């Protein structure tokens, strides 16, 4: 029968019949080992314990009562079969640990005691209890005792278990806190003491059914019911519960039986290889909060390997025939699931371990040439870098392909990696490539959490009128579900860019799982359409619950996927194509890029300078994207200085000769002020000295004066800043008066950088010790600009995004949808800057996220935010942000 089943699982079967087959292989394998042990033990008597200790089934159709036709006996227990339809469910491999669990729990059931499996999580205590309950046909309930535990429900749930004859399993019962643990223990003790009297020596025949008190009234207790307390126990239940140590399951046996039920020949070798490999991955690989090398992950890898093998054989058929290498099929399944979650350091380690446990075999990746060609078209027009392997951009495109695979498999993908990796670019390029290849439109809803209150994210009920108002994500789900507007032919990717946090994913945990439904406070349920993908673009998983991380697949975007060469290529491609002025500007931009191309290459001036600056000391934590973006903005200004120079001089425009010598020196100036503009003067001098010995750009002749003290002017010459500091004589009534600045070395150069970075409308933060002159340096440049009106705003610990909202309402007006709702200042032609006093002052949350900082980041990066009144996207028109702060060490 086993041979027939194993020959019938290789071919094409319906999924239901496939599951029936696999259940049959599991039982027939268990029966095969049991019979083989009986044969080897020379068992002849049918009353021997070696046979009497096995779960045995006795079926007698002659009985008129439905419930007692089938009798199941384990050792001396005699349960009837609750003829309740279980569905299809999932079947456990009867390992010796599972057999011991069955024996112990059945013995506890006969003694009218309870079963209390204990051990590390993931062993199979809850699943073994459920499997035993399903073997006897009982309606088994599992109560999750870690969180989302409804105490008010337990009162009637226990009564239901009593009056139905249903079981009950408490997954991780010790996770309950003492207040609710004590009362649940009291109810469980009442139930157990009521159930213990069913086996009274003198009252075994209970003419009057035995009752307990749960709802302040007597309720009958059926003998068929049971309660199981799985742990990781209260003195009430110590005398009424049998305990079993479920410490370590037989992973090799489970793997072998599952592989054999998947149709794998030589499943024993594959299991005894894959289990040690999963053991090593918990030792040799760096510990990550998202790594799952447990039993559930192993089972998932095994079923995926079975699917891969069936796909391979059915592909070969359309070109029995059982000559495929099983190990290579197992390795592909491991690598198609574990590599996306691996950090860049663990990727070579995984293949080293693979070559250790599976020597000689190699992992070959699906080419997906169809999508890799549309990637080259979505890129090269978004000014990004494409790769095809070891070449530049290969890691990023591999991460995009893995992201595509996870979107195909899962629906709650979670792109995670250090800030500065190409996560957002990856999913944007994937969305565009999918829209091009499949012809299905893709619309992205980038909802930023931690910027609005959770009530505004979902909604709430007013306790007086009981009227329901929907939140942002809830309204998005409504507009996707209720209104069609090409529903099935639009890819709604609801990207949750921001920081992951338990509080706003409590409601999402019901959506990330297979339920795919959102439960609202008012009781309505909305089901997620299959086109919707809930994407979590987050920086780290430090404050993510195990439920949320384990409920969805992910791809890890390490910092190594996006190299510096790729960023330089993006900068130069955007420079040569996108006009800074929204025709001669493009020409001068291309000339600038050509002049400055040899420095923006592999190694070279910029790479060496950035590497050297990373080992210096800065007031804030050094981020590569921060320095690179500041450098790019300064260089963009260097191409506008040429525009103004040409405009001022219609005749005799600056030719390539002057432009070359100007931009070579401006590149060094911008490198110095961008890679060391947040460090001490000694660090600036050190960076200048390092630059002097590695550059070919002509530098200031005087060696005793740092390069940081010079300016490039417009003629391509180092003009010292001291030549640009005037000697002013302030009138007597304005001596040391507010908003009175005497020019000096620092105020003439910092003002230059402020002009440079405000002409781009780029947000900036002025960092320095208190009273150093950050505010005065800013207002000496802001109010100089005719149209750059300033809005005073002070940030304290209790500051929340509502402060920015009230500032916007007071100084800005919402346009009546020219093209969507746009937030613009009341006056036209004037730019508002919201000076951020102590931008780093706001209080750190318990989950490491300042709400106002994330709120302003949402509109610095995505150019807007979401209104809380009608849940519509509002776009900033002429709003600019400027910050100032003391050093973070204070």
């Amino acid at each position: 029968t086993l041979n027939v089943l194993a020959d019938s699982v290789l071919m094409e079967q319906p999924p239901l019949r496939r599951r029936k087959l696999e259940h049959l292989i599991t039982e027939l394998v268990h029966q095969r080992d049991v019979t083989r042990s009986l044969i080897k033990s020379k068992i002849d008597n049918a009353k021997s314990f070696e046979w009497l200790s096995q779960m045995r089934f006795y079926f007698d159709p002659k009985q008129t009562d439905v419930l007692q036709q089938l009798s199941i006996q384990m050792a001396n227990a005699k349960f009837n079969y609750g003829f309740e339809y279980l569905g299809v469910q999932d079947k456990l491999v009867q390992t010796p640990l599972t057999d011991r669990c069955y024996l112990t729990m059945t013995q506890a059931l006969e003694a009218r005691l309870g079963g209390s499996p204990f051990g590390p999580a993931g062993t199979g205590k809850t699943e073994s209890v459920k499997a035993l309950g399903h073997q006897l046909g009982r309606f088994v309930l599992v109560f999750n005792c870690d969180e989302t535990f409804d105490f008010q429900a337990m009162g009637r749930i226990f009564v239901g278990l009593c009056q139905v004859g249903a079981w009950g399993c408490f997954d991780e019962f010790n996770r309950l806190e003492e207040r609710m643990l004590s009362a649940v223990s009291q109810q469980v003790q009442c139930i157990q003491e009521a159930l213990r009297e069913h086996s009274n020596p003198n009252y075994d025949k209970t003419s009057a059914p035995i009752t307990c008190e749960l709802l302040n009234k007597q309720v009958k207790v059926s003998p068929d019911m049971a309660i199981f307390i799985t742990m990781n126990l209260p003195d009430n239940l110590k005398k009424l519960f049998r305990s079993l140590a479920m410490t370590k399951p037989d992973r090799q046996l489970i793997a072998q039986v599952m592989l054999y039920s998947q149709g794998f020949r030589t499943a024993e070798v594959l299991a005894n290889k894959i289990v040690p490999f999963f053991k090593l991955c918990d030792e040799q690989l760096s510990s990550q909060s998202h790594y799952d090398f447990g039993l559930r992950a192993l089972k998932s890898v095994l079923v995926s390997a079975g699917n891969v093998k069936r796909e391979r054989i059915q592909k070969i058929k359309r070109e029995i025939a059982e000559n495929l290498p099983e190990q290579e099929i197992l390795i592909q399944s491991v690598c198609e699931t574990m590599v996306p979650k691996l950090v860049a350091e663990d990727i070579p380690l995984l293949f080293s371990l693979l070559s250790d446990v599976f020597p000689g075999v190699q992992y070959h990746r699906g080419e997906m040439t169809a999508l890799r060609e549309e990637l080259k078209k979505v890129c090269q027009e978004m000014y990004l870098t494409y790769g095809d392997g070891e070449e530049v951009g290969g890691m990023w495109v591999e991460k995009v392909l893995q992201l595509y695979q996870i979107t195909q498999i899962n629906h709650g993908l979670m792109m995670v990696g250090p800030s500065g990796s190409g996560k957002s670019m990856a999913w944007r390029v994937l969305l565009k490539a999918l829209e091009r290849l499949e012809g299905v439109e893709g619309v992205a809803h980038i909802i930023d959490p931690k910027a609005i209150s959770k009530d505004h994210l979902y909604g709430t009920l007013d306790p007086n009128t009981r009227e329901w108002t929907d939140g942002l994500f809830t309204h998005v789900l409504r507009k996707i579900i209720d209104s069609v507007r090409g529903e099935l032919q639009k890819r709604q990717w609801i990207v949750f860019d921001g920081d992951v946090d338990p509080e706003w994913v409590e409601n999402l945990n019901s959506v990330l799982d297979d339920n795919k439904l959102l439960t609202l406070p008012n009781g309505e349920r909305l089901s997620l359409p299959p086109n919707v993908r809930i994407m979590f673009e987050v920086q780290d998983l430090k404050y993510a619950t195990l439920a949320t991380v384990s409920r969805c697949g992910m791809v890890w975007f390490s910092e190594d996927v996006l190299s510096t060469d790729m960023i330089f290529n993006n900068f130069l491609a955007r420079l040569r194509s996108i006009p800074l002025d929204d025709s001669p500007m493009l020409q001068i931009q291309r000339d600038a890029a050509t002049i400055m191309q040899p420095y923006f290459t592999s190694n070279g001036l910029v790479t060496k300078a950035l590497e050297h600056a990373f080992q210096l000391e800065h007031i804030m934590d050094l981020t590569r994207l921060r320095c690179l973006g500041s450098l790019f903005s300064m260089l963009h200004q260097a191409c506008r200085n040429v525009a103004q120079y040409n405009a001022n001089h219609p005749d005799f425009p600056m030719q390539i000769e002057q432009l070359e010598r100007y931009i070579q020196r401006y590149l060094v100036y911008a490198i110095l002020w961008s890679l060391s503009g947040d460090s001490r003067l000694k660090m600036r001098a050190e960076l200048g000295e390092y630059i002097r010995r590695i550059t070919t750009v002509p530098l200031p002749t005087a060696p005793n004066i740092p390069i940081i003290d010079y300016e490039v002017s417009i003629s391509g010459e180092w003009s010292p800043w001291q030549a640009k500091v005037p000697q002013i004589e302030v009138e007597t009534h304005k001596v040391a008066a507010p908003d009175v600045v005497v020019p000096t070395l620092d105020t003439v150069r910092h003002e230059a950088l402020l002009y440079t970075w405000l002409a781009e409308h780029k947000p900036l933060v002025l960092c320095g010790p208190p009273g150093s002159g950050k505010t005065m340096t800013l207002f000496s440049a802001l109010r100089a600009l005719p149209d750059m009106e300033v809005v005073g705003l002070n940030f304290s610990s209790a500051t929340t995004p509502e402060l920015l909202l009230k500032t916007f309402d007071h100084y800005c007006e919402y346009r009546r949808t020219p093209n969507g709702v746009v937030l613009a200042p009341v006056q036209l032609g004037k730019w508002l800057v919201l000076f951020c006093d102590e931008i780093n002052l706001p209080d750190m949350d318990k989950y490491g996220t300042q709400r106002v900082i994330s709120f302003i980041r949402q509109m610095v990066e995505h150019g807007g935010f979401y209104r809380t009144s009608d849940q519509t996207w509002v776009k900033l028109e002429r709003i600019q942000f400027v910050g100032a702060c003391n050093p973070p060490t204070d």
């Binding site: 439905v66 089938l70 339809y85 309930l141 139905v164």
Partner: protein
């Protein structure tokens, strides 16, 4: 006391609309904390020796504050109970046929409550509605009636849950939905998932009057050996028990 004598002169009830197009009171925090502060202040001033400018100005208003507090802390309970029971009696169907005396008593109660709400809306002044006689006694009668009818609804839910004990696995709102949508059987299929282990749907007749079997999440069907007709067993608990029994019997025969 100077501000106390004028805060009551200008004080709106701040009426709001309802899903049934009726007026209700939304303001409760300002209507409790401010009155408590005023009564504490007047009690302190009367107790305090420095009162020889207000020899008699708060005793005539201490009783007014007590009347405000009693009327409105009964009113909040009245309105909360009324809106909850209005939702229960209107959202779910067959509430007229099931519990007819309760439904008619609640209809009369809602008529009285809406008449009172119209009376308070025509003069949205708290002084102008405290002067109306019989408001306190009518409100306590209304609250006590609401308590009794809510208790009766709970008792009916308990007696319907006692039969077919699988109802103990669902909440009060879910069980009200189950027992109210007797005609619209198609809404029950979302609750069978929690009431059973594996059963998720019931295979009904062409006109959804005879239960031919059950189904599951995957789609596996279990045709009943003897289908049960809801027509001959109109009550939901009866045919649900019959469905469970026939499921057991069908599983045994198969």
């Amino acid at each position: 006391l100077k501000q106390i004598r004028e805060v009551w002169n200008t004080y709106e009830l701040d009426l709001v609309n309802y899903q049934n197009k009726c007026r209700l009171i939304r303001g409760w925090d300002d209507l409790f904390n401010k009155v408590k502060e005023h009564i504490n202040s007047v009690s302190a001033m009367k107790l305090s020796p420095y009162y020889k400018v207000f020899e008699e100005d708060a005793l005539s208003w201490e009783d007014k504050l007590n009347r405000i507090m009693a009327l409105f802390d009964v009113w909040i309970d009245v309105q909360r109970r009324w809106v909850y029971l209005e939702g229960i009696f209107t959202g779910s169907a067959d509430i007229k046929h099931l519990l007819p005396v309760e439904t008619q008593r609640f209809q009369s109660i809602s008529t009285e409550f809406l008449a009172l709400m119209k009376k308070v809306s025509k003069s949205p002044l708290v002084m102008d509605v405290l002067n109306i006689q019989g408001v306190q006694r009518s409100l306590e009668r209304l609250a006590d009636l609401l308590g009794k009818i809510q208790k009766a609804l709970g008792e009916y839910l308990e007696r319907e849950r006692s039969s077919f004990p699988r109802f103990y696995f669902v909440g009060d709102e879910d069980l009200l939905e189950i027992i109210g949508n007797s005609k619209n059987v198609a809404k029950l299929q979302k609750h069978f998932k929690k009431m059973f282990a594996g059963v998720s749907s019931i295979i009904l007749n062409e006109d959804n009057s005879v239960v031919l079997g059950i189904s599951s999440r995957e789609g596996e069907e279990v045709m009943f050996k003897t289908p049960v007709s809801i027509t001959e067993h109109p009550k939901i608990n009866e045919w649900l028990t019959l469905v469970e029994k026939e499921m057991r019997v069908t599983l045994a025969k198969l």
